Design a protein around this ligand. Structure first.
Ligand code: DTW
Length: 345
C-alpha cells in the first residue's frame, strides 16, 4: 500500500502517482492519476469511525452528494473502502481535481469585476439547486468553494448540512453554533437554530463582500464578537425588525445598545460596481424575512449577463425529512458501508 506523509493511502490499483495536498482533523487529501479515465483526480481519505460526530458528518456528505448532480456542486466520482465492515477503517472519496479554492485565491489575487460576477453567479446557481432540494449547506465560506484552471466553481463540504425546517427554527439567545464565525448570520446569535434558507444567503453576502476587497467584511475575533462587527456596519436594526424578534433576551440586548448608523457600502467599497453593492445590501439584510432569496438574487441586474432560469436547474426530488442524531457510531458505520456499496468492487 502506498503511503503519503505518514498515512496509509490504500487506493490501488486504479489510482497511482499520488501527491500530497492537504490535511484535516481526521482526513487527508491527495491528488492521484486515474488510469481508467486517464486524468488526475482528487482523493480524500476519511477516518471517522472512532467518533460519533465524524460519522454523522461523513454520512451526511456522502448521502447528499450521491443524490445531487450539478455543475456547481462537487461530485463524488468513486468511493474506495474495504470489502467488509470489519475491515473498513477509512473511506476514500474520489472527486474532480480542482486547482484552488476561493480562500487561497483571495489571499493573493485581486478579482476583476467580471470574475466577481462570474463566481457569484455560479455560487447562486449551485445554491438554487441545493435549496430546491430542501437542503441547507450551513457552512458556506471561501474555503468551501473550489475552482479549477478555467474558473469553474464547485460547492463542497456538505458534512454540516441539514434539511430545512423553518417551522422549528426559533430558539433562545446566544445558544446556537451554526456555520463558520465570519459567515454566520446575526440571527444565529439571537434566536435562530439555522434551519432556514436565509442562513446560506447571509454567508453568500459575506463572500461577495470579501471578493470585493479581499478582506472579511465581519472579522469577529470570537463567537460573541461577531455581532459587534455586523451591527457596526449595518447600524441599529429598525423598530420593525425588532418587533419580529419575539424573544425578550434577544430583543432587550439589542435595545440596550447605543444607536449606530449604517455605514454606506459605497464608502466601504469605493471601487465596486453599484449593482454589486445593491445586491450585497439585499443579501446582508439584518431581518431574515426581508433577506433576498436565491432565485431573486440570480435575477438581480448585477447578474443579468448570465441569468437564465431554464439553465439554472433544480433538484429532481428534495429531501423530505432530516435523517442521524442519537445513532451510535456502530450504526453510522453500517450506514456509511451501505451507502458506499454501489462503488464495489
Ligand atoms: N481539508 N483539506 N485539505 C485541504 C486542501 O484540500 C484541498 N482540496 C479539497 S478539500 C475541500 C474542502 C474545503 C477546504 O478545506 N479547502 N478547500 N478538495 C479538493 C479537490 N477536489 N481538488 C483539489 N483540492 C482539493 C483544498 O483546496 C485544500 O487545499
Amino acid at each position: 500500500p502506498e503511503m503519503v506523509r505518514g498515512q496509509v493511502f490504500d487506493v490501488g490499483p486504479r489510482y497511482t502517482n499520488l501527491s500530497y495536498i492537504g490535511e484535516g482533523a481526521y482526513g487527508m487529501v491527495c491528488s492521484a492519476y486515474d488510469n481508467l479515465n486517464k486524468v488526475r483526480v482528487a482523493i480524500k481519505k476519511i477516518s471517522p469511525f472512532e467518533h460519533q460526530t465524524y460519522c454523522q458528518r461523513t454520512l451526511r456528505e456522502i448521502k447528499i452528494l450521491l443524490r445531487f448532480r450539478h455543475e456547481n456542486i462537487i461530485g463524488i466520482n468513486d468511493i474506495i473502502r474495504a470489502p467488509t465492515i470489519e475491515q473498513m477503517k477509512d473511506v476514500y472519496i474520489v472527486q474532480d481535481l480542482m486547482e484552488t479554492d476561493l480562500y487561497k485565491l483571495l489571499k493573493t489575487q485581486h478579482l476583476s469585476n467580471d470574475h466577481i460576477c462570474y463566481f457569484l453567479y455560479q455560487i447562486l446557481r449551485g445554491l438554487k439547486y441545493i435549496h430546491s432540494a430542501n437542503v441547507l449547506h450551513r457552512d458556506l465560506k471561501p474555503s468551501n468553494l473550489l475552482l479549477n484552471t478555467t474558473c469553474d466553481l464547485k460547492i463542497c463540504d456538505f458534512g454540516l448540512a441539514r434539511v430545512a425546517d423553518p417551522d422549528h427554527d426559533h430558539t433562545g439567545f446566544l445558544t446556537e453554533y451554526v456555520a463558520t464565525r465570519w459567515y454566520r448570520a446575526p440571527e444565529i446569535m439571537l434566536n435562530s437554530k439555522g434551519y432556514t434558507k436565509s442562513i446560506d444567503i447571509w454567508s453568500v453576502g459575506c463572500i461577495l463582500a470579501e471578493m470585493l476587497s479581499n478582506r472579511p467584511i465581519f472579522p469577529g475575533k470570537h463567537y460573541l464578537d461577531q455581532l459587534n462587527h455586523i451591527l457596526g456596519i449595518l447600524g441599529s436594526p429598525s423598530q420593525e425588525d425588532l418587533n419580529c424578534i419575539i424573544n425578550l433576551k434577544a430583543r432587550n440586548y439589542l435595545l440596550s445598545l447605543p444607536h449606530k448608523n449604517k455605514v454606506p457600502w459605497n464608502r466601504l467599497f469605493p471601487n465596486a460596481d453599484s449593482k454589486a453593492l445593491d445586491l450585497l445590501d439585499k443579501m446582508l439584510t439584518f431581518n431574515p424575512h426581508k433577506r433576498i432569496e436565491v432565485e431573486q438574487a440570480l435575477a438581480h441586474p448585477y447578474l443579468e449577463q448570465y441569468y437564465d432560469p431554464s439553465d439554472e436547474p433544480i433538484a429532481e426530488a428534495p429531501f423530505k425529512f432530516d435523517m442521524l442524531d442519537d445513532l451510535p457510531k456502530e450504526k453510522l458505520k453500517e450506514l456509511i458501508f451501505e451507502e458506499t456499496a454501489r462503488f464495489q468492487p
